[PDB]
Amino acid sequence: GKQYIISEELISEGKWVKLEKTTYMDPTGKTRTWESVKRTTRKEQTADGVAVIPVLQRTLHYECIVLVKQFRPPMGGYCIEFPAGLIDDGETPEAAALRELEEETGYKGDIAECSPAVCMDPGLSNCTIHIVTVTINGDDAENARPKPKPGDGEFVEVISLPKNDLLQRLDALVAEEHLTVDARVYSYALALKHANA
Amino acid sequence: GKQYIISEELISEGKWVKLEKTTYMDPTGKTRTWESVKRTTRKEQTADGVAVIPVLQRTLHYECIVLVKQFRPPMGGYCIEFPAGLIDDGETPEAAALRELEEETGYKGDIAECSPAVCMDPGLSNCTIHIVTVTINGDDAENARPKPKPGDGEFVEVISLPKNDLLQRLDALVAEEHLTVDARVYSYALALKHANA
Numbered sequence: 001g002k003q004y005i006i007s008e009e010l011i012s013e014g015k016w017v018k019l020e021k022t023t024y025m026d027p028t029g030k031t032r033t034w035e036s037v038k039r040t041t042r043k044e045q046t047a048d049g050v051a052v053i054p055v056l057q058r059t060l061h062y063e064c065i066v067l068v069k070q071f072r073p074p075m076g077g078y079c080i081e082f083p084a085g086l087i088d089d090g091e092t093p094e095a096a097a098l099r100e101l102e103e104e105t106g107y108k109g110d111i112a113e114c115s116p117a118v119c120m121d122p123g124l125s126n127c128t129i130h131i132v133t134v135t136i137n138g139d140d141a142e143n144a145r146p147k148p149k150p151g152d153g154e155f156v157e158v159i160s161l162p163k164n165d166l167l168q169r170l171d172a173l174v175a176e177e178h179l180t181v182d183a184r185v186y187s188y189a190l191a192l193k194h195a196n197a
Numbered sequence: 198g199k200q201y202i203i204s205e206e207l208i209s210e211g212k213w214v215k216l217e218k219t220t221y222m223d224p225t226g227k228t229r230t231w232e233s234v235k236r237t238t239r240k241e242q243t244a245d246g247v248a249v250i251p252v253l254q255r256t257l258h259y260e261c262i263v264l265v266k267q268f269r270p271p272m273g274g275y276c277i278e279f280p281a282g283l284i285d286d287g288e289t290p291e292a293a294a295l296r297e298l299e300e301e302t303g304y305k306g307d308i309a310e311c312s313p314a315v316c317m318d319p320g321l322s323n324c325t326i327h328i329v330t331v332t333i334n335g336d337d338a339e340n341a342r343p344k345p346k347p348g349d350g351e352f353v354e355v356i357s358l359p360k361n362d363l364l365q366r367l368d369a370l371v372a373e374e375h376l377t378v379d380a381r382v383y384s385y386a387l388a389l390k391h392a393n394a
């Protein structure tokens with residue numbers, strides 16, 4: 001028997017996040033519940049945000065993956081992640097990705113590809129994002145002196161690491177600093193390693 | 198200046214998840230708030246769970262990545278993910294990995310590598326997992342006819358896709374029906390294609 005949602009009761013709602021009690025039908029026709037999380041900023045027929053995989057390309061160097069370091073309140077510490085942001089109203093995933101990349105890193109990129117909506121943590125929330133691959137011409141005079149343009153309550157640090165040695169460099173950051181690496185960044189790094197050998 | 202947590206005020210706590218209002222100090226010395234989510238099952242000094250990257254190997258065959266498909270209440274639909282589960286009390290990440298892999302797919306594997314705790318969705322929750330790379334000897338009799346041993350309220354479908362064509366195969370599954378691929382699975386698949394550049 002196929003499963004389906006029966007009802008979604010609001011438990012508590014903040015200005016950005018809300019908790020819900022989800023009642024659904026299981027394969028055996030039995031009613032069960034689940035505690036779900038959702039963002040209050042999600043628009044209809046639109047993913048919550050985007051994560052950007054910024055590939056910095058330079059003539060004299062191997063490719064680099066541009067990451068950002070930010071203090072994350074929910075984590076109680078600093079985290080290393082792909083640049084990311086919530087999609088603004090009417091804005092396409094691609095546009096959101098280029099804007100957030102420039103805002104958080106100062107780099108002006110070009111779209112390479114865009115994934116369909118993927119889930120962030122399906123066992124807990126309904127949060128989804130588009131993973132957008134963007135290339136950056138690191139030799140262009142325009143990208144010589146990049147500087148972020150963060151908002152009021154935002155201070156991002158840019159950290160670019162070699163694509164051919166990503167996993168190792170991420171491990172070093174974890175060991176030497178008070179940092180947590182994002183699961184998507186690490187999954188990306190593991191496959192780069194697994195593909196290689 | 199270094200940012201840090203000033204206080205955490207409980208907003209709503211459930212059986213599995215809770216919502217809190219976090220107050221922290223920004224780089225300038227000003228206090229700001231943030232809405233954060235946490236799992237109530239989280240034990241101090243340990244990550245919430247593990248995600249397993251199972252590589253099914255067989256002589257003279259392409260390698261396959263074992264994934265699971267399950268109905269996810271928060272998403273209101275089915276999702277394709279790496280087998281994963283919460284870490285049991287006192288259980289090590291590696292043991293959780295092999296245990297969850299067997300319960301969800303029936304396969305018995307060997308640990309290849311284990312990542313440090315990485316965050317699932319930092320801008321929203323404090324959820325963390327260890328991504329454990331595991332290899333499955335597809336030529337061993339015990340792995341010939343593996344059968345999932347799920348819980349009372351767990352219903353999983355095993356889907357193994359070729360590692361050599363992972364991203365394309367994921368797209369083909371999504372073209373067939375309403376399905377959402379996990380962001381970590383997609384990040385992994387993307388890097389397999391982006392590697393060697």
Ligand SMILES: Nc1ncnc2c1ncn2[C@@H]1O[C@H](COP(=O)(O)CP(=O)(O)OC[C@H]2O[C@H](O)[C@H](O)[C@@H]2O)[C@@H](O)[C@H]1O
Pocket residue numbers: 016017048049050084085086087120127128129153154230231232233318319320321
């Ligand atoms: N939970 C919150 N509590 C208080 N204020 C909030 C919260 N979420 C967002 N905001 C406000 O909206 C802004 C969105 O920042 P983005 O930069 O536009 C989005 P970013 O934070 O970068 O996240 C991008 C993706 O990764 C995150 O972990 C989520 O998965 C998200 O989908 C935050 O910087 C803050 O000003």
Ligand SMILES: Nc1ncnc2c1ncn2[C@@H]1O[C@H](COP(=O)(O)CP(=O)(O)OC[C@H]2O[C@H](O)[C@H](O)[C@@H]2O)[C@@H](O)[C@H]1O
Pocket residue numbers: 033034035036120121122123124213214245246247281282283284317324326350351
């Ligand atoms: N939110 C919830 N509401 C109601 N009951 C719950 C909830 N979370 C866990 N449970 C209970 O604990 C079990 C944990 O299953 P795992 O299988 O042990 C953990 P799994 O679901 O697989 O997730 C593992 C990792 O990937 C998922 O996205 C999770 O968010 C986590 O990051 C659930 O099957 C259910 O019995």
Ligand SMILES: [Mg+2]
Pocket residue numbers: 083084085086100104
């Ligand atoms: Mg951001």
Ligand SMILES: [Mg+2]
Pocket residue numbers: 085086100
């Ligand atoms: Mg933004």
Ligand SMILES: [Mg+2]
Pocket residue numbers: 084085086100103104
């Ligand atoms: Mg932003």
Ligand SMILES: [Mg+2]
Pocket residue numbers: 280281282301
């Ligand atoms: Mg599970």
Ligand SMILES: [Mg+2]
Pocket residue numbers: 282283
């Ligand atoms: Mg379990």
Ligand SMILES: [Mg+2]
Pocket residue numbers: 281282283297300301351
């Ligand atoms: Mg399980």
